[PDB]
Amino acid sequence: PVSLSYRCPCRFFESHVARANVKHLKILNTPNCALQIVARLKNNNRQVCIDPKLKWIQEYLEKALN
Amino acid sequence: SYRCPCRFFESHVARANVKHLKILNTPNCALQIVARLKNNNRQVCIDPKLKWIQEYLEKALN
DSSP: OOOOOOOOOOOOOOOOGGGHHHHHHHHOOOSSSOOEEEEETTTTEEEEBHHHHHHHHHHHHHHHOO | OOOOOOOOOOOOOOOOGEEEEEEEEEEEEEEEEEEETTTOOEEEEOOTTTTHHHHHHHHHHO
């Protein structure tokens, strides 16, 4: 049983992000972590972990889901 | 001339070889998925219809 090590990049999340504030989403392949979504923001290029429960996220992911 | 990042796509990618998925959705380009590969750190446009993609995204929305 070889365990692999991976650090969860997101410990905190932001819920005050609108679809228009985002340049793109990054969804980390760390299914072991509760927060896997990082948004690269427009204007300043800051990266922030966002609330997975934001309604616009599933719309943004549109076809890959719906 | 701001073009769309993806014009050609790959349909054969092992989830084990993906570090993360970069997802863009613009009016002009629609949904485009780029994967950063683990074996070579390259970015590759992938078929959004790949089998594991839906499950990969669903799990992240939980």
